[PDB]
């Protein structure tokens, strides 16, 4: 049983993963993934920071999916305060929530192929990604790591003109997804390296807490977005892409299908986004508008206290989970009455998925392990936190 | 509402299958797609000559602004220090002889800074702003640490564009 | 004061379905042209 460290710096291994492996022949006898090569303290650091200054940590937890993560903390802090965002903000979060799902799937499908050896899909879709980033930048200011979705709504209304461009792009992106399919969906070779690799049973997927496409790929029907609606994902209409004969190829097809379904959700959001405000009107939770803080005393006091001290969330604890592109992203945020949190365990769709690597890659070749790490969309930020 | 992504022997059917298997058709299909793009205009930009577009809210590099008269805007309320997530900004102040309130030392550690843009948000006089420039890569680590004089100098150099950028986005804020 | 909103009447429609075209020479026809080439070559 030859032992070998897949290696932190592996061109294939996403980020840095030391996958100590015992390989009988080329077959992988045992898979003991090592983690923490990217532990950084995100959970302890948050205890020493106020709610609004811990929002930027969430973007960094799994930064492929920059915003969708922010929505989970937002929702969580809103629940604890029993405040809910204004109607326009909700649609925004679903608009950028979905755009972000595409961004993650373009990452997951194209990076999967680069490890497999197909390199042209990545360049094709990274150009589309690029175009999306620009939406982020023109809405938040940052290409990624925006900090746009804050605990009481979004930070600033969309620029005057973004919606139109999030249309032109959406109107075309489909063809770009179509092109990739041609090369891979039916490549006489993609199928082989992906089909019947890492099959996970339905009962086993629920047991190991997979909770993501990984469950959906095995045929279990669960989309937290339809089962437990958050924001206004209830008012839209989309089809969960369930899969059968769950294997690397089937789940892939599912991720390409949610890229397709997210364009259906984005279209609607553009078609039906309401006129209104983008942040709660409670100066108590949301910072006052700058014209107001510069002309009204109560607004300055509320601006000064909010930025310097904080929300002062009422004491309680909540576990709120959304459907981040990877899977169920949840924040268990225990909170004392103080302005800074007490605990914030981030449930990472990924801590559970990696664990499954062992029960998925059994009697498999070195190349199979590379394919399976891809079909779990492992971003070491969320796993290591 | 759910959907089945991959739910699913006549001679013709079998023969066509064999045609694909032995003539590698689905492989030739893939080659056609790449040949097609070879003919598309590539999307790259000459980086020094042409620059990727950044709109007014781009956070980029920190600068401290001054009033048109010439009085630096910062009045050392020090809540930019309070809301800095990374502990980057260090401010110590004392009453200037004028009697006014000014910062003796304002040090943004850019390596500590994660460019969140909250400081831009928090300032009441809006003295500290996220300036447009993103190209400030430096040979030595010390250069990245910035004192009041570098930021004020950064502010003077980019004030014209900073003013235009704040002009465009203030209604939104 | 203006707020970026969907244009009046809503935006146009987008494609959310694969438009991959099932275009190919039929298999028999494909084999016949090939076998004919070998027959001519052999002769």
């Amino acid at each position: 049983n030859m032992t070998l460290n897949f290696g932190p710096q592996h061109p294939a291994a996403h980020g840095v993963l030391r996958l100590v492996l015992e390989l009988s022949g080329e077959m992988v006898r045992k898979c003991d993934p090592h983690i923490g090569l990217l532990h950084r303290g995100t959970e302890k650091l948050i205890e020493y920071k106020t709610y609004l200054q811990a929002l930027p940590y969430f973007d960094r937890l799994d930064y492929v999916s920059m915003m969708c993560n922010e929505q989970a903390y937002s929702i969580a802090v809103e629940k604890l305060l029993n405040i809910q965002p204004p109607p326009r903000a909700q649609w925004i979060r679903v608009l950028f929530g979905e755009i972000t799902r595409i961004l993650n799937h373009i990452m997951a499908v194209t990076t999967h192929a680069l490890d497999i050896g197909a390199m042209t899909p990545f360049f094709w879709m990274f150009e589309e990604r690029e175009k999306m980033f620009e939406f982020y930048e023109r809405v938040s200011g940052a290409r990624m790591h925006a900090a746009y979705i804050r605990p009481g709504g979004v930070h600033q209304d969309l620029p005057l003109g973004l919606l139109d461009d999030i249309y032109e792009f959406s109107k075309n992106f489909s063809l770009r997804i179509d092109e990739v399919e041609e090369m891979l969906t039916n490549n006489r070779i993609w199928r082989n390296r992906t089909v019947d690799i890492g099959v996970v049973t339905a009962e086993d997927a629920l047991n190991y807490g997979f909770s993501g496409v990984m469950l959906r790929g095995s045929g279990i029907q669960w989309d937290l977005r339809k089962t437990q609606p958050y924001d206004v994902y209830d008012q839209v209409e989309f089809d969960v892409p369930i899969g059968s004969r769950g294997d690397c190829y089937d789940r892939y097809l599912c991720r390409v299908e949610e890229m397709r379904q997210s364009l259906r959700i984005i279209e609607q959001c553009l078609n039906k986004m309401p006129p209104g405000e983008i942040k709660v009107d409670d100066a108590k939770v949301s910072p006052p508008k700058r014209a107001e803080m510069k002309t009204s005393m109560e607004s300055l006091i509320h601006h000064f206290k909010l930025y310097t001290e904080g929300y002062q969330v009422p004491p309680g604890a909540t576990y709120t989970a959304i459907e981040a592109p990877k899977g169920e992203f949840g924040v268990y945020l225990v909170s004392d009455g103080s302005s800074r949190p007490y605990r914030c365990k981030i449930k990472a769709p990924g801590f559970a998925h990696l664990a499954g690597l062992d029960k998925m890659s059994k009697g498999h070749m070195l190349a199979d392990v590379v394919a399976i790490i891809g079909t779990q969309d492992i971003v070491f930020g969320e796993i290591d936190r | 509402t759910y959907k089945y992504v991959n739910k699913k022997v006549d001679m013709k059917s079998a023969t066509d299958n064999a045609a694909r298997i032995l003539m590698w058709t689905e492989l030739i299909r893939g080659l056609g797609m790449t040949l097609s793009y070879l003919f598309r205009e590539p999307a790259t930009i000459n980086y020094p000559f042409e620059k990727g577009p950044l709109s007014p809210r781009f956070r980029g590099e920190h600068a401290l602004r001054r009033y048109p008269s010439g009085e630096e805007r910062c009045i050392a309320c020090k809540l930019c220090e309070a809301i800095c997530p990374a502990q980057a900004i260090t401010i110590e102040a004392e009453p200037r002889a004028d009697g006014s309130r000014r910062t003796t030392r304002y040090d943004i550690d850019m390596t500590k800074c994660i460019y969140c843009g909250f400081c831009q948000e928090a300032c009441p006089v809006d003295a500290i702003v996220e300036g447009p420039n993103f190209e400030f890569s430096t040979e030595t680590h010390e250069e990245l640490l910035y004192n009041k004089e570098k930021l004020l100098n950064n502010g003077d150099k980019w004030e014209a564009e900073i003013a235009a950028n704040i002009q465009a986005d203030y209604l939104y804020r | 004061v203006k707020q970026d909103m969907p244009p009046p009447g809503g935006y146009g429609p987008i494609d959310y379905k694969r438009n991959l075209p099932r275009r190919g020479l039929s298999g028999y026809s494909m084999f016949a042209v090939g076998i004919g080439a070998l027959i001519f070559g052999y002769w």
């Binding site: 032109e168 075309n172 063809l175 179509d178 041609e182 | 056609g32 205009e41 999307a43 | 075209p21």
Partner: peptide
């Protein structure tokens, strides 16, 4: 763009669909 009407047709024939309608070059 700037297909010239012949590189475009090789592009359309090879792809099997009209890229002209959904181009990679965003324009005004």
């Amino acid at each position: 763009a700037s297909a010239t009407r012949v590189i475009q047709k090789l592009r359309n024939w090879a792809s099997g669909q009209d890229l002209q309608a959904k181009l990679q070059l965003r324009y005004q």
